[PDB]
Design a protein around this ligand. Structure first.
Ligand SMILES: Cc1cn([C@H]2C[C@H](O)[C@@H](COP(=O)(O)OP(=O)(O)OP(=O)(O)O)O2)c(=O)[nH]c1=O
Ligand SMILES: [Mg+2]
Ligand SMILES: [Mg+2]
Ligand SMILES: [Zn+2]
Lengths: 217, 243, 645
RNA sequence: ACCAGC
């Protein structure tokens, strides 16, 4: 509410995450750290601009609450400043998923995260049309829920066509596949993802089984 | 949880005092235990005494556990009922009297429940509409089975039950005791039982309390709406036949 | 001989995932660790150590660790994996027989232990007692998450694999090895003429005592019958709860109008307190102010109030004379409810998904080798002589298990031994009276003719009286059995002492063997001991707590072991006869209370085979140790555990 | 302290 919290005036510390599955090197790379204010330890994520200047803090408690310290824009992404190009990006849903993906690749592919999630993804993707023009492939990595499928269906409209690929997961998102030893599936869904198939259109070739079973009953 | 026995000091017994994992001891011989308004009424200010209700039948430990305490402010007798949260902190109160002049203090939310701060895991839940029936079911079951109760009457059934959806989702069988209705709860889980009186207190004060407990453990399934089958009409098809 | 340690995600009831495992060896001295992806290599190492003819050392391995491996190796990678019981050894089953007395030696050490570990055979408590403990995983993980800031949800930290789990697993196998060296550093059980870290499964078992073998067989079988369970009926106990929960809510309505309320001092602050019949102060006060004199003062200022003085109580008001019976019935109904359905360890809070109850059975929990039962106690349910007893034992039946291939219920057989400690007495004193006492026991029933000779009303009262006289009573506690005075309490002692004058000679023999001097204090007793322990039937040092219970710890510690070998032999004959143990076979053990066994089988012919071979097993027990008596049992057949009592 | 069991 007041201002950007400095780590010195809030007893900041860049450490690992044991119960989540993120080491301290990735948190040192991104800028996710923990402050000690009001007695209770509060986790905090840092938002930067395209240049690299700090624009916003995001403070989360031990009971999963949200707290914005100031002006919260729509063109601010969590993990955007570190990369200024490339050939393949992976867009996540939350914020720990960015640390989860950059943990398992040693900072080789550009990974960004959304600032609102799945509720207001269309607003933060319509204003971010110009940043994704310098890219070559886009891999959307959202939740395997109803809101996740609705967000990946409605957010692929304002993006450039021919580059948006959607991957599937057996977990809820990338973090449970990181915890349960499924580190072999998420590395294949980035390199080889599913192409365009919006709901409503059905190709005439991939309909053999339904027409086979339909004339049986 | 019980661990083992230590020798007591006040009564001088050998195997009387029992130690527990919570840090407190208890002796079984000497019986010594060790260790609107928008204003929440303080317990040390409002002269809080946990008295019992004789004319309806409620023990003292039930009022000590549920938080239903009599205040002696202004020379009169008020019955303050407290609402809490999942962390266990005082959020809102209800001051009720003989003239039912309600004085709802504090931040009374739309999804407040009475008795949700002690009971979070289990298998069965009994939901009532008031507070006296909730205390009656706790008196019958000796304050050990999950019973919650609404806080806005039987007219906010589309709002209070709908907002608390992940709270009721943890339980396996939800049994209703409203009136002798809401469908926002997940299906295949809701049971509704029928009693011969208006509520549970009129069954407790007249000898039908056994028929309370028979409707709790063997409650029938919820027919959704006014649709019927072709077997429950068997008497009425007879009755119109004899008109 | 290798020493293995496991770590998985949850308890044996619901386990689905392997996390890590450490193996130490006594020939290469290697902390061979494993990862979550090396579970096939872990199983291959254990199968190699089995196939070369060695021993695998676990801790709590019979109950949890080996069936966890058999469950995970099936339901994670689809391969059968069974360890033979003569290869797996435990270091908890050894601790419960060598260090069988920790509550009487653990004081003076509590300066080391925190206080919650007082008298615990757990593996962390021996880490504190051996002065080798480097942290704890749960405390450090909770301190780690509070340092990061994310919450600590449920006390479940074996969800995800990490690297601290491997380190504390290595410290776990260090503590297991340092326990095993001290447990094998004992000389009464393991003779110091051979090293036990390189011998096979034919030398380690049969070049030592028999108490080290019978205890491991008993732990194996009791863990198996714990995994089987006890079939239980839920509807027939919910009907009982809804029956007698509408009775204590009438016995208080009818009673508070009789016994009125009163003001009790809390300017004098008073409060309007009402009559609570569960308290034994309110009834004492209301009987003090209604014209009753106790004439019995156990406490220094208060009387004693129980069922034997609430019968012999008379008042002037003829309403209270009827009200006292309702008070006793209310106390009975309150105890019934708190045991059956409303307690923290009730029956309806330990029923699994398949409709069975799993209760822990400690094979060596008492100092005299008697098994204890816990979580819940299936040796403490009300018998058929107490009110609401048959309705509580009819739910604990074996006909509540319909078969999984033909849809039919099963049959139950229950086998009880007769005159067990009273016949062990005739074994032990047959060298004094030349064996003319062990002939009348074999000539007709003993307790019925004892009831005839002592004019007791019931056989249960005669059976209580004979052991009350035998295990060193006083002048009044065996006159109280008939209710009479110390004159009859003296003449019954003289009558049953002048019949066979060998009990006093045996007691004098035990006193001349154990104790040598006993100085007398007017409020205490100071004794210089000579031998605090007694050699049992298989060389085990049975500990003696008090010198007037020496006949007790000589009789029941020799009576528990014949039942402990009998329950082993009565399946060693059935498996070798050509049957199959478990629910998918032909029979299954369900419960072992202190004397009798309860087995459930598929057909009546299998019931007849079991009820035949129990006699042959008991006779082989009686022949293996050369008893001077003749042991005999008695079996019953039925649907549930109300006819088979 | 009370109850229950073996
Ligand atoms: C009743 C009782 C038995 N016991 C002992 C006697 C037995 O060895 C064992 C179980 O006792 P019981 O099985 O009750 O008696 P029993 O086996 O001698 O007679 P029967 O089977 O023919 O009815 O525990 C006690 O130590 N104290 C007691 O109060
Ligand atoms: Mg272990
Ligand atoms: Mg017997
Ligand atoms: Zn005391």
């Amino acid at each position: 509410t007041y201002n950007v919290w400095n780590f010195g005036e809030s007893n900041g510390r860049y450490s690992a995450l044991t119960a989540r599955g993120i080491s301290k090197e990735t948190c040192q790379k991104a800028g996710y750290w923990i402050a000690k204010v009001d007695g209770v330890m509060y986790q905090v994520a840092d938002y930067r601009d395209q240049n690299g200047n700090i624009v916003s803090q995001k403070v989360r408690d031990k009971d999963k609450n949200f707290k914005t310290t100031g002006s919260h824009k729509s063109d601010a992404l969590f993990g955007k400043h570190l990369w200024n190009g490339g050939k393949k990006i992976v867009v996540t849903e939350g914020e720990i998923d960015m640390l989860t993906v950059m943990e398992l690749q040693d900072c080789k592919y550009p990974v960004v995260s959304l600032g609102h999630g799945a509720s207001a993804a269309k607003k933060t993707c319509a204003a971010n049309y110009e940043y994704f023009d310098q890219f070559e492939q886009i891999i959307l990595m959202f939740d395997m829920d109803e809101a996740g499928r609705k967000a990946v269906e409605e957010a692929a409209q304002v993006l450039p066509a021919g580059k948006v690929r959607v991957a599937v997961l057996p977990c809820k998102d990338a973090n449970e596949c990181h915890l349960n030893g499924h580190d072999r599936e998420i590395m294949e869904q980035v390199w080889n993802a599913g192409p365009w198939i919006p709901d409503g259109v059905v190709s005439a070739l991939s309909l053999r089984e339904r027409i086979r079973e339909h004339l049986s009953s | 949880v019980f661990l083992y026995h230590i020798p007591c000091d006040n009564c001088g017994s050998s195997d009387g005092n029992s130690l527990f994992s919570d840090g407190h001891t208890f002796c079984y011989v000497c019986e010594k235990w060790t260790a609107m308004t928008y204003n929440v009424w303080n317990f040390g200010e409002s002269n809080g005494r946990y008295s019992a209700l004789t004319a309806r039948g409620i023990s003292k430990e039930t009022c000590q556990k549920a938080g239903y305490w009599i205040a002696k402010v202004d020379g009169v007798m008020y019955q303050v009922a407290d609402y809490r949260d999942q962390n266990g902190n005082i959020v809102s109160q209800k001051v009720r009297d003989k003239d039912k002049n309600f004085k709802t203090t504090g931040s009374h939310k739309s999804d407040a429940l009475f008795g949700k701060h002690l009971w979070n895991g289990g298998k069965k839940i009994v939901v009532t509409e008031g507070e006296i029936d909730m205390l009656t079911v706790m008196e019958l079951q000796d304050c050990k089975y999950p019973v919650v109760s609404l806080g806005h009457g039987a007219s906010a059934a589309k709002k209070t039950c709908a907002a608390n959806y992940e709270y009721f989702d943890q339980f396996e069988q939800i049994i209703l005791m409203f009136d002798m209705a809401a469908q926002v709860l997940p299906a295949g889980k809701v049971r509704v039982a029928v009693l011969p009186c208006k509520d549970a207190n009129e069954c407790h004060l007249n000898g039908h309390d056994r028929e309370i407990m028979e409707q709790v453990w063997n409650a029938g399934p919820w027919i959704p709406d006014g649709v019927v089958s072709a077997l429950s009409l068997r008497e009425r098809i007879r009755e119109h036949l004899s008109s | 001989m290798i020493v293995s340690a496991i770590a998985a995600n949850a308890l044996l009831e619901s386990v689905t995932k392997f996390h890590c495992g450490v193996i130490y060896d006594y020939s290469t001295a290697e902390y061979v660790s494993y990862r979550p992806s090396d579970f096939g290599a872990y199983l291959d190492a254990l199968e190699a150590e089995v196939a070369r003819g060695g021993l695998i050392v676990f801790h709590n391995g019979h109950k949890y660790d080996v069936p966890a491996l058999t469950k995970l190796a099936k339901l994670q990678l689809n391969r059968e994996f069974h360890l033979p019981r003569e290869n797996c050894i435990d270091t908890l089953v050894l601790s419960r027989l060598i260090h069988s007395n920790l509550k009487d030696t653990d004081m003076g050490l509590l300066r080391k232990l925190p206080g919650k570990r007082f008298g615990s055979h757990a593996l962390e408590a021996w880490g504190y007692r051996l002065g080798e403990m480097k942290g704890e995983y749960k405390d450090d993980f909770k301190r780690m998450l509070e340092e990061q800031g994310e919450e600590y949800v449920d006390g479940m930290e074996w969800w995800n694999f990490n690297e601290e789990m491997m380190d504390y697993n290595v410290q776990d196998v260090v503590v297991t090895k340092a326990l095993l060296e001290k447990l094998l550093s004992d000389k009464h059980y393991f003779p110091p003429e051979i090293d036990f870290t390189d011998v096979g499964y034919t030398t380690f078992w049969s070049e030592s005592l028999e108490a080290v073998d019978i205890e491991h067989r008993a732990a194996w079988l009791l863990a198996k019958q714990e995994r089987n369970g006890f079939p239980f009926d839920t509807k027939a106990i919910e009907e009982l709860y809804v029956e007698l929960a509408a009775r204590r809510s009438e016995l208080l309505r009818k009673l508070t109008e009789t016994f009125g309320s009163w003001y009790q001092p809390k300017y004098t602050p008073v409060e309007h307190v009402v009559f609570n019949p569960s308290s034994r102060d309110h009834i004492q006060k209301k009987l003090q102010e209604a014209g009753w004199v106790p004439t019995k003062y156990t406490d220094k200022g208060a009387p004693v109030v129980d069922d034997e003085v609430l019968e012999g109580v008379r008042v002037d008001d003829p309403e209270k004379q009827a009200a006292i019976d309702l008070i006793k019935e209310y106390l009975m109904i309150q105890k019934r409810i708190g045991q059956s359905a409303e307690g923290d360890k009730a029956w309806l809070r330990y029923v699994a998904e398949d409709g069975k109850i799993h209760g822990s059975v400690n094979p060596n929990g008492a100092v005299t080798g008697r098994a204890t039962h816990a979580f819940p106690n299936l040796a403490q349910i009300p018998g058929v002589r107490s009110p609401y007893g048959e309705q509580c034992r009819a739910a604990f039946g074996a006909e509540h298990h319909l078969d999984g291939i033909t849809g039919k219920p099963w049959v139950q057989a229950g086998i009880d031994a007769s005159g067990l400690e009273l016949r062990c007495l005739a074994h032990f004193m047959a060298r004094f009276d030349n064996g003319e006492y062990a002939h009348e026991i074999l000539n007709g029933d003993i307790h019925t003719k004892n009831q005839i000779a002592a004019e007791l009303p019931t056989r249960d009262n005669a059976k209580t009286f004979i052991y009350g006289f035998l295990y060193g009573a006083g002048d009044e506690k065996i006159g109280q059995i008939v209710g009479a005075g110390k004159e009859r309490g003296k003449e019954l002692k003289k009558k049953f002492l002048e019949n066979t004058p060998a009990i006093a000679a045996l007691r004098e023999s035990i006193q001349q063997t154990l104790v040598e001097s006993s100085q007398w204090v007017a409020g205490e007793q100071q004794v210089k001991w000579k031998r605090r322990w007694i050699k049992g039937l298989d060389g085990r040092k049975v500990h003696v707590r008090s010198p007037h219970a020496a006949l007790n710890t000589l009789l029941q510690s020799a009576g528990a072991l014949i039942c402990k070998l009998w329950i082993i032999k009565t399946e060693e004959m059935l498996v070798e006869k050509g049957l199959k143990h478990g629910w998918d076979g032909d029979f299954a053990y369900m419960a072992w209370v202190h004397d009798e066994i309860q087995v459930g089988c598929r057909t009546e012919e299998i019931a007849q085979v079991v009820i035949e071979t129990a006699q042959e097993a008991m006779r082989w027990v009686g022949d293996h140790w050369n008893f001077r008596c003749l042991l005999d049992t008695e079996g019953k057949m039925g649907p549930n555990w109300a006819i088979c009592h």
